[PDB]
């Protein structure tokens, strides 16, 4: 089919480490205006995670050079570094807007009220991607993406607390990312820790409700909550 031809393509690109091709294909799959399964939805998320990760990684490296160069007082060089850092930034933003546009035009719009699992997934994704914009925004543009991010996370969280077990991977992942949102984007560490400690303790309480089929994912994310917690609290 058109649709299975695209999912086939996506899987080949994943194996080939060709994430821009993986993203075109999942974009096209989404643009069919039909719902995504868990597997399909994880392909979308892996695709864009890796694309945008590479731009963020690059942006960080060049931004870091820019700051050293400004501090050194090197005017001629700075204008060059800054130009490149800006070029990378336009790419990064384009990837974020493409994702956000999908979430709005197709993915979140077509969720039933009882599709709690999907709504939580896409709303965490909307939070994540506005958070990526906020990593690089400034001025009044920054405030708008910061707010949209928090609004998306907040809404996902209310649903997951009500409809998902504290050991559920999506819920834990959401908690991890929203706690990062507070710590790094809002510069609000006290808030970030309670949230991370809450979600951890809450998963520890209900360990005998964990089917073996998920022990790998949930313990992994729990480990990451604890790292963040130890790293942050010392400081």
């Amino acid at each position: 089919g058109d649709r299975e031809q695209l999912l086939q393509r996506a899987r080949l690109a994943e194996q080939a480490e060709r994430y821009d091709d993986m993203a075109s294909a999942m974009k096209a799959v989404t643009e069919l205006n039909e719902p995504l399964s868990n597997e399909d939805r994880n392909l979308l998320s892996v695709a864009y995670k890796n694309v945008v990760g590479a731009r963020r990684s690059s942006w960080r490296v060049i931004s870091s050079i820019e700051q050293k160069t400004m501090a050194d007082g090197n005017e001629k060089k700075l204008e060059k570094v800054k130009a490149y850092r800006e070029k990378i930034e336009k790419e990064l933003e384009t990837v974020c807007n493409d994702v956000l546009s999908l979430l709005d035009k197709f993915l979140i719009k077509n969720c039933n009220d009882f599709q709690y699992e999907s709504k939580v997934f896409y709303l965490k994704m909307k939070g994540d991607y506005y958070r990526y914009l906020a990593e690089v925004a400034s001025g009044e543009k920054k405030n708008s993406v910061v707010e949209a991010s928090e609004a998306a996370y907040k809404e996902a969280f209310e649903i997951s607390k009500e409809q998902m077990q504290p050991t559920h991977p999506i819920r834990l992942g959401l908690a991890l990312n929203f706690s990062v949102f507070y710590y790094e984007i809002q510069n609000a560490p006290e808030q970030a820790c309670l949230l991370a400690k809450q979600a951890f303790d809450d998963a520890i309480a209900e360990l005998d409700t964990l089917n073996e089929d998920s022990y790998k994912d949930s313990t992994l994310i729990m480990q990451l909550l604890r790292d963040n917690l130890t790293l942050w609290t010392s400081d």
């Binding site: 834990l172 990062v180 990451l224």
Partner: peptide, 5 residues
């Protein structure tokens, strides 16, 4: 400073 994989 890891986020969810």
């Amino acid at each position: 400073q890891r986020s969810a994989p």
